[PDB]
Amino acid sequence: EPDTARLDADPSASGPVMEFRELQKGAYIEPTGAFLTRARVSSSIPYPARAACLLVAVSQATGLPTRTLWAALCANLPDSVLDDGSLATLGLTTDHFAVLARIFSLRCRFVSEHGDVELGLHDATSRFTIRHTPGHFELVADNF
Amino acid sequence: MQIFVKTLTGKTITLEVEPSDTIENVKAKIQDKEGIPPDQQRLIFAGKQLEDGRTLSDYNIQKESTLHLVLRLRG
């Protein structure tokens, strides 16, 4: 259980390991939020500008400032999930988006080289589509 | 034994596994058939997120049960 061990080793985390789905219940679209996490006041990880292409895409589609999106992640995720050691190298994941969707009521269809995945909340206020290529996120109209 | 893997699109994939196959082994088996790298694979059983180092039996995942495959993307 590498996910559980990395969370149990996180000093910024408290409580038992559980899915974000259960830590912060909401109108999730299956399987949004089904990733293991722990509860935290706020993380001090500075805005990862060079690797925030995921936040830029969400920001462009919603109008939410990129730094507003980051602050939300810093206030709801332990440091181990915000930075698993490759934050600067590999950036953010669809799990980070699942948290933003719960906080800001978002729904996004991700179009990837290896298929699509729909993540967010059911009656979301903002609906958009993001394209994934190896290592990159880009807002699109409604690809493929 | 045989287990099933169901994707977001509803497609059903059939894998041949043993109770001691690790979740990492399952992901490799899925890669052989689907072409999805383990990095982009999340597997869920009965609502629980499965972790790579555990076995099917560690989760009590028995014959002819269904795993749920979901994409995880990073960038």
Author numbering:
A (entry chain A): 7 to 46, 49 to 152
B (entry chain B): 1 to 75
Describing publication, verbatim:
Maize rayado fino virus (MRFV) is the type member of the genus Marafivirus within the family Tymoviridae. The polyprotein characteristically contains four nonstructural domains that comprise the viral replicase (methyltransferase, protease (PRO), helicase (HEL), and RNA-dependent RNA polymerase (RdRp)) as well as the major structural coat protein (CP) for genome packing. The main function of PRO is to act as a polyprotein processor, but it has been shown to have auxiliary function as a ubiquitin (Ub) hydrolase to aid in bypassing the host innate immune system by removing Ub from the RdRp, preventing its degradation by the Ub proteasome. X-ray structures of MRFV PRO alone and bound to Ub reveal unique structural characteristics that differ from TYMV PRO and notable conformational changes that occur in response to Ub substrate.
MRFV PRO was covalently linked to Ub. Specifically, Ub-3Br is a suicide substrate of deubiquitinating enzymes that is a modified form of WT Ub in that its C-terminus is modified to harbor a reactive C-terminal tail, which can irreversibly bind to the active site cysteines of DUBs through a covalent linkage. The C-terminal tail of Ub nestles deep into the active site channel of PRO and numerous additional interactions of the enzyme with the beta-grasp fold of Ub. Two of these features are essential in how PRO recognizes Ub, which are the hydrophobic Ile44 and Ile36 patches. Hydrophobic residues P37 and A40 of the long loop connecting ⍺1 and ⍺2 grip against the hydrophobic Ile44 patch. Although not hydrophobic, R27 is a key residue for stabilizing Ub binding at this region because its guanidino group hydrogen bonds with Ub’s main-chain carbonyl group of G47. R27 is clearly important in MRFV PRO recognition of Ub and could be a factor that we can attribute into MRFV and OBDV lacking the ability to recognize and subsequently process Ub-K63 chains. Interestingly, in the presence of Ub, the C-terminal tail of MRFV PRO adopts a conformation highly similar to the GPP flap of TYMV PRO (unliganded and liganded) as there now is a turn following β5, which allows for the formation of a 4-stranded β-sheet and a more canonical, rigid active site. Furthermore, MRFV PRO forms a much more extensive interaction with Ub than TYMV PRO, with a complex formation significance score (CSS) of 1.000 (scale being 0–1) as determined from the PISA server.
